[PDB]
């Protein structure tokens, strides 16, 4: 089998991407944030505290003839940005782009933190990291990809995120029309549960490539590109007036600037992020200070190849027995 679904930016900045997902019988369609950095499929639901729902579409398990309470199971998750959610668990039929999994753990939120409530466009998350990170207790549950893998034509999914435009998540096949050149594959460590790999270096604008190993994660659920402070300082030094602002929480730059590109290495290959992809707009409405899309990872503990990086490439998440990652230009 295969599946193919369009993923759409939630706003004019590409702050995140939502993909429609069918849950239950008859189908209830929710727009979920596909997140290769976590491993829980959780949804706003009829069980979510009413004051914490503000415009999201909710899953109502009592209206699904295939929903079954997973007795005794609870979940609770905290994300790198400080947000969180928790609740109980059903199993139900879940379909993405024509690909159907029966018995998928659908984690029903009883509580969500303010940033989820405040984002009316995201109805939940669909985790695509390794199932070892799944938070369901006492019986850890499998991701949608893990449950579908054996049925897929090939044990892969691909992320093709657009810049200010829709893109595609495919399951079970590699669309050879969706990229240019060849796909360069690189080793993955699953030791932390992530799609963790080592970039071979970077360049700023037309500058020379610096060969240096940068361990990080391919994370569709993170907006920006988070790299070591040395790398980030080298980038922003090429933008007149750019500075790190503790009060804003990162590098800002004059909105009048033209940003240089940023290149990252995948083996001997190179992925070029155009400068425009690094512009996240005014820090507040009407400000002439703009927020940068490349930020320091120094406070995180891990480097994160988030959407800013991934949207510049066609990315293969290869879930074969030894997983690997593939990157192509497009």
Active-site residue numbers?
Answer: 35, 199
Q: Please say whether the beta carbons of 156 and 3 come within 8 A.
A: no
What is the bridge-based pairing of β-strands 124-127 and 41-43?
antiparallel
Measured from the Cβ of residue 317, the count of other Cβ atoms closer than 10 Å reads: 23
Q: Please say whether the beta carbons of 119 and 11 come within 8 A.
A: no
Phi-psi region at 259: left, alpha or beta (left = phi > 0; alpha = psi -120 to 50):
beta
Alpha helices in 151-310 (DSSP H): 229-236, 307-310
Q: How many CA atoms lie within 13 A of 246 on its CB side?
A: 0
Rounded to 5°, angle at Cα 25 from 20 and 31:
15
Q: Who contacts 327 (Cβ-Cβ below 8 Å, separation ≥6)?
A: 183, 184, 186, 266, 269, 271, 313, 314, 315, 316
3-state secondary structure of 231: helix
Q: Please say whether the beta carbons of 191 and 172 come within 8 A.
A: no
Q: Round to whole Å and give the CA distance between 275 and 260.
A: 5
Q: What are phi and psi of 90, to 5 degrees?
A: -115, 160
3-state secondary structure of 47: coil
Q: Round to whole Å and give the CA distance between 115 and 84.
A: 9
Cα radius of gyration (the chain): 20
Segments making up each domain of the chain, as ranges? 5-174, 175-330
- Resolution in angstrom units: 1.3
3-state secondary structure of 43: strand
The CATH number corresponding to 5-174 among 3.40.50.300, 3.40.30.160, 2.40.70.10, 3.30.700.30 equals 2.40.70.10
How far, CA to CA in Å, does 329 sit from each of 87, 95, 222, 315?
A: 40, 29, 20, 9
Scan for tokens 């990086």, then name that residue: 309
The helix or strand, by DSSP H or E, that contains position 116, with its residue range, turns out to be helix 114-117
Take residue 70 and report the two structure tokens written for it: 């997973």
How far, CA to CA in Å, does 24 sit from each of 3, 61, 253?
A: 17, 8, 46
Take residue 168 and report the two structure tokens written for it: 């595609």
The strand pairing partners of 54, in sequence order, are none
The CATH number corresponding to 175-330 among 2.40.37.10, 3.40.250.10, 2.40.70.10, 3.40.50.2300 equals 2.40.70.10
Take residue 14 and report the two structure tokens written for it: 């590409």
Q: Round to whole Å and give the CA distance between 111 and 98.
A: 30
Q: Please say whether the beta carbons of 261 and 272 come within 8 A.
A: yes
Sign of CA pseudo-dihedral 101, 102, 104, 106: positive
Q: Which of 325, 326, 320, 322 is nearest to 155 (CA)?
A: 320
How far, CA to CA in Å, does 74 sit from each of 107, 139, 305?
A: 8, 9, 30
Q: Which of 111, 118, 98 is nearest to 22 (CA)?
A: 98
Sign of CA pseudo-dihedral 249, 227, 158, 106: negative
Rounded to 5°, angle at Cα 272 from 308 and 244:
50
3-state secondary structure of 78: strand
Q: Round to whole Å and give the CA distance between 39 and 44.
A: 16
Question: Starting from the edge strand earliest in sequence, which strands make up the sheet with 243-245, in order?
Answer: 243-245, 250-254, 289-292, 279-282
Q: Please say whether the beta carbons of 94 and 106 come within 8 A.
A: yes
Q: Round to whole Å and give the CA distance between 275 and 4.
A: 29
Q: Round to whole Å and give the CA distance between 109 and 46.
A: 9
Q: Round to whole Å and give the CA distance between 289 and 283.
A: 6
Confirm whether 5-174 and 175-330 share one CATH topology: yes
Q: Round to whole Å and give the CA distance between 39 and 325.
A: 17
């Amino acid at each position: 089998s295969t599946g193919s679904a369009t993923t759409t930016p939630i706003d004019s900045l590409d702050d995140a991407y939502i993909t429609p997902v069918q849950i239950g019988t008859p189908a209830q369609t929710l727009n979920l944030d596909f997140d290769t950095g976590s491993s829980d499929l959780w949804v706003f639901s009829s069980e979510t505290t009413a004051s914490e729902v503000d415009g999201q579409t909710i899953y109502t398990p009592s209206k699904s003839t295939t929903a079954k309470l997973l007795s005794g199971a609870t979940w609770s998750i905290s994300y790198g940005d400080g947000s969180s959610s928790s609740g109980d668990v059903y199993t139900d039929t879940v379909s993405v782009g024509g690909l159907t999994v029966t018995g998928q753990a659908v984690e029903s939120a009883k509580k969500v933190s303010s940033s989820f409530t405040e984002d009316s466009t995201i109805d939940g998350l669909l985790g695509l990291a390794f199932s070892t990170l799944n938070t369901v207790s006492p019986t850890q549950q499998k991701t949608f990809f893990d449950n579908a893998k054996a049925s897929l034509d090939s044990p892969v999914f691909t992320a093709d995120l657009g810049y200010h435009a829709p893109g595609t998540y495919n399951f079970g096949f590699i669309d050879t029309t969706a990229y240019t050149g060849s796909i360069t594959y690189t080793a993955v460590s699953t030791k932390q549960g992530f799609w963790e790999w080592t970039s071979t270096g970077y360049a700023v604008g037309s500058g020379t490539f610096k060969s240096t190993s940068i361990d990080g994660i391919a994370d569709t659920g993170t907006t920006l590109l988070y790299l070591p402070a040395t790398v980030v300082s080298a980038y922003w030094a090429q933008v007149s007036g750019a500075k790190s602002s503790s009060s804003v929480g990162g590098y800002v730059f004059p909105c009048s600037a033209t940003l240089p590109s940023f290149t990252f290495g995948v083996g001997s290959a190179r992925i070029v992020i155009p400068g425009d992809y690094i512009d996240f707009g005014p820090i507040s409405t009407g400000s002439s200070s703009c927020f940068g899309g490349i930020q320091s990872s120094a406070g995180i503990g891990i480097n994160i190849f988030g959407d800013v990086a991934l949207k510049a490439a066609f990315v293969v998440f290869n879930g074969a027995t030894t997983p690997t990652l593939g990157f192509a230009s497009k």
